[PDB]
């Protein structure tokens, strides 16, 4: 008992805005669909919006304070400004000055709340229509690595400065610093697993998109009706991959492959990063004791010097 | 309309002789047949020759010429950069060269074979395009960049853990590699590709064995984000993003030894533009 | 000793074997499901 029209054209807090809908022409020509709106706002979508903009307000006002309230320097230096966690002399303490770590703590708390309420919104909107709750658990697997990066790894290490700063350049800096601190991240085996799954995900996405577009004369992309009776396009795709690889898939379980290949990336990444500082303080030395490092006794270093 | 078919009729209906590239050039394909499930043709024999020879040369260079039975301790290395672009059978890097060449043949053969099969089933050419993107990645890394630099010793070693030492040393020779703009574009496209794959898998799985219509998923994707893309546009976006991810990364690695030496210096121009240079005081100058 | 450490087996080689074996098994079951007999449109009429 689901009335889709009522689910899309209701009023109130439990309702939609951006009605009447709009239409973009170039999106219609390139992508096949051009309607924008309406968009549901509820209780879990108003708590995410307000908390996200609270954290963003804190970050941007601190940027302005660092610059000196000068708009021109603000525009010049925007992409290398950052709000950093409290230094190592403090532990996990919250008694830190505002310009030395308090703003980071406040903004991170509000961001935590916003991502949790967004998960709740996805779950409840999946149940409101007639579909399953598979996007919610995919977001949960993605959020595992987020919470390791921002909450759990600093907790187990004992300081907030193990966490990234809030900026455009600061995330790249965090990546570099964390790899340098704990030996070499190339010799982290769960880093290897994560890279396996990420590159496999990109491989699979390109393959599926190309093979569905290639057989679209026979309407193979209408995957809802193809899972009830398969027509010429799906048959051609199956024969293509059987004659290339020696085995093929369905119009159903290919998307199972997609879901699990995308999900394993974040889980293996979370495990590897969490183990990175707490159990193995040096990955090159560990790999030397585990017999996975090549000797290299006489390098030709003329390649690496100008 | 629809009944139960055992998939033998499906395969027997679509097998036809001679619509490939060799059949259009020479008038006949010398290897137009099937072995098991695989289709052999011209470019299927060439590819298999390349595969066997590449595996044999790799294993000979690893087990012999290095004396190791550990597959994770091998360094299948190119010649030194002092040798230039010369090949000599009496010098250490020779077998690496052989392996490299063989792999190229295999990879290129694979690509052409796909085109043949696409022509047998009357399809578009999307899979060859998407695969040719990453074949061009291999060619840029192993052929174009070493020739522009001037030595075969600028190519990557082919060990399982040792080709990563090349990545580390090359990345820290042109420090900071994170500041490479094409590198950032490539990383962005990789992350977006994985996100899109997860979203599409979830969306199709969430409506599979249910007594609903095909419009429920559009209402769902329009209540959450305000826009639903469609069924031809999700798969088009997948194809395009997957290809562009590596197409933009080719430039980042080609422009490293040529035209650039330092990615921190590349940005030195930004603060010197007339709009905002000479406006602050103290540590806020420049 | 020419042997790795125990965490070398726990962290490197067991996950490697598990990945390879799981890929083989998942591929086998995917292909078994895909090449069975179920509802299809007739290729002779539909083309």
């Amino acid at each position: 008992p689901i009335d889709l029209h009522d689910e899309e054209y209701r009023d109130g807090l439990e309702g939609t805005i951006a009605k009447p809908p709009g239409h973009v022409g170039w999106m219609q020509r390139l992508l096949g669909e051009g309607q924008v709106g309406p968009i549901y706002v509820g209780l879990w979508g108003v708590i995410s919006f307000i908390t996200f903009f609270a954290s963003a307000f804190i970050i941007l006002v601190d940027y302005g304070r660092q610059v000196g309230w000068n708009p021109i320097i603000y525009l010049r230096e925007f992409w290398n400004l950052a709000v950093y966690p409290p230094p190592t002399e403090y532990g996990l303490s919250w008694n830190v000055p505002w310009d030395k770590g308090g703003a980071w703590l406040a903004a991170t708390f509000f961001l935590h709340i916003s991502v949790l309420t967004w998960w709740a919104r996805l779950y409840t909107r999946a149940k409101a229509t007639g579909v399953g709750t598979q996007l919610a658990w995919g977001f949960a697997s993605a959020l595992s690595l987020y919470f390791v990066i921002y909450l759990f790894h600093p907790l187990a290490l004992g300081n907030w400065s193990a966490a990234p700063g809030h900026g455009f350049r600061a995330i790249l800096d965090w990546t570099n610093y964390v790899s340098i601190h704990w030996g070499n991240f190339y010799y982290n085996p769960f880093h290897m697993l994560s890279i396996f799954f990420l590159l496999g995900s990109t491989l699979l996405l390109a393959m599926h998109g190309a093979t569905i577009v290639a057989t679209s004369k026979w309407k193979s992309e209408m995957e809802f009706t193809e899972m009830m009776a398969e027509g010429p396009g799906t048959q051609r795709a199956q024969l293509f991959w059987r004659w290339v690889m020696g085995w093929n898939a369905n119009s159903y379980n290919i998307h199972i492959w997609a879901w699990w290949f995308a999900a394993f990336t974040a889980i293996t990444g979370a495990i590897g990063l969490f183990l990175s500082g707490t159990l193995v303080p040096d990955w090159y030395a560990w790999g030397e004791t585990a017999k996975i490092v090549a000797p290299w006794p006489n390098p030709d270093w003329a390649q690496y010097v100008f | 309309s629809a009944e139960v078919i055992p998939f033998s009729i499906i395969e027997e209906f679509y097998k036809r002789p001679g619509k490939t590239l060799a059949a259009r050039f020479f008038g006949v394909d010398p290897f137009d047949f099937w072995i098991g499930r695989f289709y052999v043709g011209l470019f299927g024999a060439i590819s298999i020759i390349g595969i066997i020879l590449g595996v044999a040369f790799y294993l000979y260079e690893g087990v012999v010429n290095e004396g190791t039975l550990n597959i994770l301790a091998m360094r299948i290395e190119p010649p030194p950069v002092s040798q230039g672009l010369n090949v000599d059978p009496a010098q250490p890097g020779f077998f690496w060269f052989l392996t490299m060449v063989a792999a190229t043949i295999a990879f290129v053969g694979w690509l052409l074979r796909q085109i043949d099969i696409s022509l047998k089933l009357d399809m578009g050419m999307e899979v060859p395009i998407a695969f040719g993107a990453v074949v061009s990645s291999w060619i840029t890394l192993q052929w174009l960049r070493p020739i522009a630099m001037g030595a075969w010793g600028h190519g990557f070693p082919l060990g399982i853990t040792h080709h990563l030492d090349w990545v580390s040393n090359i990345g820290y020779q042109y420090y900071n590699f994170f500041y490479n703009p094409f590198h950032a574009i490539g990383i962005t496209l990789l992350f977006a590709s994985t996100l899109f794959l997860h979203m599409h898998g979830s969306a199709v799985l969430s409506e599979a064995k249910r007594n609903i219509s095909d419009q429920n998923i559009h209402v769902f994707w329009r209540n959450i984000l305000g826009y639903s893309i469609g069924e031809i546009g999700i798969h088009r976006v997948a194809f395009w993003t997957g290809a562009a991810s590596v197409l933009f990364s080719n430039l980042c690695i080609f422009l490293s030894g040529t035209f650039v030496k330092d990615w921190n210096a590349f940005w030195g121009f930004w603060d010197k533009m007339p709009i905002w240079n000479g406006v602050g005081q103290g540590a806020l100058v420049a | 000793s020419p042997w790795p450490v125990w965490s070398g087996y726990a962290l490197c080689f067991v996950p490697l074997a598990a990945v390879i074996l799981g890929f083989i098994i998942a591929a086998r079951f995917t292909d078994k499901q895909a090449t069975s007999a179920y509802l299809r449109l007739d290729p002779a009429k539909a083309n």
């Binding site: 899972m227 009776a229 398969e230 369905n250 | 064995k209 | 069975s36 179920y38 509802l39």
Partner: peptide, 10 residues
């Protein structure tokens, strides 16, 4: 009765 998704519907 037998369907692509593995479900056998009547």
């Amino acid at each position: 009765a037998a369907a692509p998704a593995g479900a056998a519907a009547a």
